[PDB]
Design an enzyme around this catalytic site. Structure first.
Site, short mmCIF file in Angstrom:
data_model
loop_
_atom_site.label_atom_id
_atom_site.label_comp_id
_atom_site.label_asym_id
_atom_site.label_seq_id
_atom_site.Cartn_x
_atom_site.Cartn_y
_atom_site.Cartn_z
N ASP A 104 118.26 27.31 -68.06
CA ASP A 104 119.35 26.44 -68.54
C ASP A 104 118.85 25.75 -69.81
O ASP A 104 117.87 24.99 -69.75
CB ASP A 104 119.73 25.35 -67.53
CG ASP A 104 120.68 25.85 -66.44
OD1 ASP A 104 121.03 27.07 -66.44
OD2 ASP A 104 120.96 25.04 -65.56
N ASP A 122 123.62 24.90 -70.11
CA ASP A 122 124.17 23.92 -69.17
C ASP A 122 124.24 22.62 -69.95
O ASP A 122 123.27 21.89 -70.04
CB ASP A 122 123.27 23.81 -67.93
CG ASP A 122 123.93 23.01 -66.80
OD1 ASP A 122 125.04 22.46 -67.03
OD2 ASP A 122 123.31 22.86 -65.71
N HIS A 158 130.70 27.61 -60.74
CA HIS A 158 130.68 27.21 -59.34
C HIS A 158 131.94 27.71 -58.67
O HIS A 158 132.99 27.80 -59.31
CB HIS A 158 130.68 25.68 -59.15
CG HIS A 158 129.56 24.97 -59.82
ND1 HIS A 158 129.61 24.62 -61.15
CD2 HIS A 158 128.38 24.47 -59.34
CE1 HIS A 158 128.49 23.98 -61.47
NE2 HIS A 158 127.72 23.90 -60.40
N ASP A 186 120.76 12.09 -67.11
CA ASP A 186 120.86 13.49 -67.55
C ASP A 186 121.93 13.64 -68.65
O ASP A 186 123.12 13.47 -68.39
CB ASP A 186 121.20 14.32 -66.31
CG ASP A 186 121.22 15.86 -66.55
OD1 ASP A 186 120.45 16.41 -67.37
OD2 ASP A 186 122.04 16.49 -65.86
N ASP A 190 134.83 25.54 -59.56
CA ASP A 190 135.36 25.60 -60.93
C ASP A 190 136.48 26.62 -61.02
O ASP A 190 137.38 26.48 -61.85
CB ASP A 190 134.28 26.04 -61.91
CG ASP A 190 133.12 25.09 -61.99
OD1 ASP A 190 133.31 23.88 -61.79
OD2 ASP A 190 132.00 25.59 -62.22
N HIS A 193 116.09 18.46 -67.47
CA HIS A 193 115.63 17.98 -66.17
C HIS A 193 114.12 17.77 -66.15
O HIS A 193 113.64 16.74 -65.69
CB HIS A 193 116.04 18.96 -65.06
CG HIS A 193 117.53 18.96 -64.86
ND1 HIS A 193 118.18 19.82 -64.00
CD2 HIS A 193 118.49 18.23 -65.48
CE1 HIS A 193 119.49 19.61 -64.09
NE2 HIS A 193 119.70 18.64 -64.96
N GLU A 195 117.31 25.49 -59.10
CA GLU A 195 117.37 24.68 -60.31
C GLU A 195 116.85 23.29 -59.99
O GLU A 195 117.57 22.54 -59.30
CB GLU A 195 118.79 24.59 -60.81
CG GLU A 195 118.91 23.75 -62.13
CD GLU A 195 120.33 23.70 -62.60
OE1 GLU A 195 121.16 24.52 -62.16
OE2 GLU A 195 120.63 22.84 -63.45
N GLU A 239 115.78 23.69 -66.23
CA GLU A 239 116.68 23.17 -67.25
C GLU A 239 115.88 22.27 -68.18
O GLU A 239 115.14 21.42 -67.70
CB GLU A 239 117.82 22.33 -66.66
CG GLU A 239 118.76 21.85 -67.72
CD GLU A 239 119.95 21.09 -67.15
OE1 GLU A 239 120.66 21.68 -66.35
OE2 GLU A 239 120.16 19.92 -67.51
N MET A 277 125.74 35.07 -63.51
CA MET A 277 125.29 34.02 -62.62
C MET A 277 126.44 33.30 -62.01
O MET A 277 127.43 33.06 -62.67
CB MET A 277 124.35 33.05 -63.35
CG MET A 277 123.55 32.12 -62.42
SD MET A 277 124.66 30.59 -62.22
CE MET A 277 124.30 29.75 -63.76
N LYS A 333 115.71 19.27 -60.33
CA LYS A 333 116.13 18.09 -61.09
C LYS A 333 115.46 16.94 -60.37
O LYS A 333 115.43 16.95 -59.13
CB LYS A 333 117.66 17.90 -61.09
CG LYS A 333 118.05 16.80 -62.04
CD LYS A 333 119.57 16.58 -61.98
CE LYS A 333 120.04 15.59 -63.07
NZ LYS A 333 121.52 15.32 -62.90
N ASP A 346 122.49 16.22 -70.99
CA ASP A 346 123.09 17.55 -71.20
C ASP A 346 123.63 17.71 -72.64
O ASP A 346 124.75 18.20 -72.85
CB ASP A 346 124.20 17.80 -70.18
CG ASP A 346 123.65 18.11 -68.80
OD1 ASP A 346 122.43 18.28 -68.62
OD2 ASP A 346 124.49 18.19 -67.87
MG LIG Z 1 121.59 23.11 -64.96
MN LIG Z 2 121.37 18.42 -66.66
#
Ligand SMILES: [Mg+2]
Ligand SMILES: [Mn+2]
Ligand SMILES: [Mg+2]
Ligand SMILES: [Mg+2]
Ligand SMILES: [Mg+2]
Ligand SMILES: [Mn+2]
Ligand SMILES: [Mn+2]
Ligand SMILES: [Mn+2]
Lengths: 386, 386, 386, 386
Positions: free
Chosen positions: A244, A286, A53, A254, A56, A219, A180, A216, A87, A182, A256
């Site tokens: 993802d 991710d 991002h 979530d 980041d 998700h 993406e 993802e 990406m 979610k 992850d």
């Molecule tokens: Mg993701």
């Molecule tokens: Mn996630």
């Protein structure tokens, strides 16, 4: 054994290995990682590239000169390691200004700011060689029914993506967008909650060829959906631009988890599909190393993402190459599923008495599908028990 | 008080009030209802019309003469009562021949039979004046990963719907198709599992203008999704051709409770949206009177479907008409959500320094959205506490 | 390879392999199996025994002489094969009389009938050598809030189980009871919905030592719960009298897949726990061969239940025997979890300045738990990738 | 209209109205509230009292003198307002040292520190007049199977609660403990995940009379369970010591919406039960004003918690007082549910031929339960449509 190389195209977000372990109930358990150190550590593990991002890589509110400094340091680490940046994406969710959304915030001036912040980072992503620009609308949605008129919000969402498409085409950029989905978290419900909703929305954009999905694992599983089925639909529509990979244990927050954790058989069927279909995009993770871990645990978790992909790739390939499995697939008529129902056309179907008047429904009903023997051959292959 | 009339367009499937109460663990608790008696009883309650599967009206395997007899009896009851038939559908799920699907069965001869059985009933639906033909692919899917190649199945699903579209256009029929999504049950996962997946699939058909969705309250809620949000997306795409109203208590087996049971606030926001958007299709109840009930309970449950719709309609109208609510909506900037983000265009946005360089993000972040006061005004209206 | 023998104690219900494939949306796809044929087929596969509901073995409403005939035929097949009957249970859910429950039906005369029907089958189970009598209260519950006062229903549930305990003690029977929890389906909510609720209820019975739990993999997973965690709590309380093994894909209708399907890693951790704890009861499969299958598929599915147990047993044993795993467990302080927190007592803890005043919380916070490296060693073991 | 007074016993945690709006994806949207200001604002709204974690009131790591200062300021605000403190609890989840738990952390020295931190705050709670001490084990659990041996962890959990019971009895304190269950979040699975698991665990403590449950609406709903059913079981066991009221929309992350949001009919049936049973503990709101809101929205959300309770109380009372509802309850045999099944005893039941040999099961099966008419009377009452 099962060692990744950069030709496996494994990528990681800076925010993944760099997650400090702040969750809704707890403070950070790890210090911040310098992006340069992440790039070097991931390169040593066999990663192909990293993603980011804007926020980041460049701390929010940085001056233009600090911004160049951060980018130059980052560029040097990419050059020193051979790491790519395939990406990039925009943080439109952390800052309080985005508490009701970016592109679909009720306040118009926030929506305009969301678009300007995005456009700035598209320029940066193109300069770093990114092919795909991801949009995760994590704040677009609502906790209550009256707060968001969803038709107006979809108008605003389409407006925002159309402007971004006009911007990249007017600049001559060779970048595509991937939404993406979610279903919820951090908003009570998020707009475009699944791969299907996102695919449907794309078809109403001015230039639909510019937009695909970045689904993802976790998700879709937060809605209890079958992730390989959703990916097959995205492939069928020609819209799987990016993916993802991670793990999730059912319908909850979530998680992850590292890829291969969570629903392991779904991971097996996902890898089977990606490899069979010749998906050639990045294998992006991710994921969040759990906040129980120190930095050695962070890198062990990252390594496990790629190890589990490579083990599942081997088992899926062995499954499809097995003569006994190929015979079982014919026994279950997967060959017949691939044949047209009525290549002879409507009129021939209507005149074909074997399709209705003289069809023996009882004989057809009596045929077993032999799906359980096939599924146990897939289990034996997954477990290495043959 | 709250009494339905046929101009409210309430409709019921024959299979709803006629459900005998066979569930996976138990025998029927009620005798079969003659369709003629259902039509008369529903007409007395204020229903506008009824819907049917082929096999509800004509017992499976009936001779051509028995078939005419059944249709003529049914036609007479419609004439005696004024009841309409706005929708019909095909049973492609009960008979054992459909154990692996109709349109996406692995066996090709079953797929051809599925199409012929459907076409026969389209002719019958047109003759009875149905405007919408619903397809619920309840057997299209899988319990295991290797049993169904989902890309091939989507090819077969598109083939089947394209042939049906070619059939109705070649006959000059004025009927449209509506796909009814469901995520699971009776298959472990069903293809096109949500409103979004169905909308996305429609865009790949040869003649997409012929196809819309028939979403069901409980089905989207079986994936934990927000049903008013999904309906708003269907309306936004111009694809809400029909709707199934009922109740569901969260993520579990398909309960098909009477409308208003299950998630009551979601029912309120659904009625608000349907009425605000001017949805003018049938208000169809796809519900099952619980198997605890005798026939008096069946009709009480049917009556409650329409009563709850009419109460929620009144409360939603009162909510939107309240000056204090209209002020609250402006306080929460719903008026600004309806305005274009950038009608001045991309270049003006890029040159607008108030959108980025001189945007006061901290002042914007500090603005409360006042969503909780708005939501409590909606609660007070729903409960009649103002 | 991985071949079961009767010393593995694998058992199956008559209703499992004998399920005809009637689901809420579809007719039977298989003919009824004669119990005698099931016993013989299961004995050939390596099963140790079978279980039954009264109504599986004796058709409902059979005369006393037909009843003896059915039992004698069954007894002969057990003698011919060496098969045991370690568990029996009562069908209090199929017949319409039980539409509102057996033990907690609102109608008192139904409750008395439920008890008499149960007592009759306890006598039969003891005569066949069953050690455990299972109660699954599938109809005890409600679809709506006012239909069931749950305190009164729990009074009636305790009354029923107390009478059964008085009956077995007065007859001198050496049989114990096991409550099988399920959260929903066929009722909208079922009483005693999880292993925890059942364990808590047992503690209020007159003679709690007579009652334990019979948890089922898929049922706890229908509430999104961790099944190995629930089993560990049942073991901790000394109450795991029996267990039902199968597979389930998340929060949806009760799928009853073959064991090893569904959540495969949860199956691995379940087998690890059962084997480590020395569970010595039956390994019972409460599963349904999918209705896609013919009779050859039924037996393949049954065989797969036991194969998957035996593969997971081998992988879990290899995991626990691996020196590298034993070192990792110490690295993650599982040895310290097994040591008393304060065997020195309350007063010593209160005076121990290293427990608070001089505790270095920051040094303790900095210690990683090394859980990810441990979990990847468990993944490698499960997949046979070491 | 519907105005709370302190005799309604409404209480709020300091952490509820004081939540700054940090979620896993976003920074704080509101400044910190001084506890003194919360006490005054809540007193003006009609609250009866407040609750606290140690770390809400005394910043973590405060010196002993800062600690006294914070307590004295707080005491003065309670004296100025008349506000009570009926409950207190320990933060064993925010600090990184608790990343693997407090009472069940693998590291023994953390477990001892967790106990000392708890004991210190019990002394403070008694001094402020708290009657109930709540334990929410939010970090007790695991993300992976090998990280936590659940039998050893339950040993450690029982050890910790036994020491706390020994401490309060040795000091002569008149305080009871209440365990607050939650199934997941922030850990992948949390130990004692539901009201049932907690009740079962309590029965193995040395002094079970000291321990009860503090169930939370949203937590049971995160497992898809019926919250009024769980509360009825807690009441039946005599263990409902405290309750947390809020709203939740199904199986997802812990939303902590204001009470009445989420599942509104479940809120109605909860209030009906609490009022009918004469629950006389605090009506405590464990809720988070959404991070969209400014401080005016915080207090509107807090006010809505109590308003919705008082509206539902009125509607539930009207429901139970309605002669037509009382007739319907008899029509549905709720009176018969309250009568003993067999007060005549086992032997009389065994000799009673009307209970089995001469029971007309078909006549009994034919009786409708009239549950739908009853449920629609409850709907009409909830909506004020009668
Ligand atoms: Mg993701
Ligand atoms: Mn996630
Ligand atoms: Mg429907
Ligand atoms: Mg079972
Ligand atoms: Mg709470
Ligand atoms: Mn349904
Ligand atoms: Mn089951
Ligand atoms: Mn909560």
């Amino acid at each position: 054994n099962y060692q990744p190389t950069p030709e496996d195209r494994f990528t990681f977000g800076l925010w993944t290995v760099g997650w400090q372990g702040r969750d809704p109930f707890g403070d950070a358990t790890r210090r911040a990682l310098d992006p340069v150190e992440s790039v070097r550590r991931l390169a040593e593990l066999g990663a192909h590239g990293v993603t980011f991002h804007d926020d980041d890589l460049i701390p929010f509110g940085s001056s233009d000169s600090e911004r160049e400094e951060h980018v130059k340091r980052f560029r040097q680490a990419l050059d020193d390691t051979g790491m790519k940046v395939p990406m990039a994406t925009t943080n439109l969710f952390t800052h309080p200004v985005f508490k009701d959304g970016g592109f679909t915030a009720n306040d118009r001036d926030v929506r305009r700011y969301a678009l300007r912040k995005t456009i700035r980072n598209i320029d940066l992503a193109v300069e770093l060689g990114a092919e795909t620009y991801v949009a995760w609308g994590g704040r677009e949605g609502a906790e209550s029914g009256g707060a968001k008129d969803v038709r107006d919000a979809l108008d605003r969402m389409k407006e925002a993506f159309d402007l971004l498409g006009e911007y990249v085409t007017s600049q001559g950029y060779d970048i595509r967008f991937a939404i993406e989905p979610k279903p919820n978290e951090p908003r009570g419900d998020i707009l475009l909650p699944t791969v299907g909703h996102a695919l449907a929305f794309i078809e109403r954009l001015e230039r639909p060829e510019l937009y695909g999905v970045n689904p993802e694992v976790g998700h879709e599983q937060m809605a209890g959906l079958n992730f390989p089925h959703g990916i097959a639909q995205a492939l069928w529509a020609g819209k799987l631009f990016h993916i993802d990979l991670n793990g999730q244990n059912g319908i909850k927050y979530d998680q992850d988890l590292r890829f291969g954790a969570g629903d392991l058989r779904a991971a097996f069927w996902l890898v089977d599909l990606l490899e069979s279909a010749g998906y050639s995009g990045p294998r992006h993770f991710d994921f969040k190393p759990p906040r129980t871990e120190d930095f050695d645990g962070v890198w062990a978790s990252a390594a496990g993402c790629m190890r589990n992909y490579l083990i599942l790739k081997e088992r899926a390939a062995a499954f499809r190459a097995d003569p006994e499995v190929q015979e079982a697939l014919r026994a279950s008529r997967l060959d017949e599923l691939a044949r047209p129902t009525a290549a002879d056309g409507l009129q021939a179907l209507l005149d074909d008495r074997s399709a209705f008047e003289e069809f023996d429904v009882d004989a057809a009903a009596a045929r077993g599908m032999a799906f359980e023997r096939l599924d146990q051959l897939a289990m034996d292959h997954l477990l290495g028990a043959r």
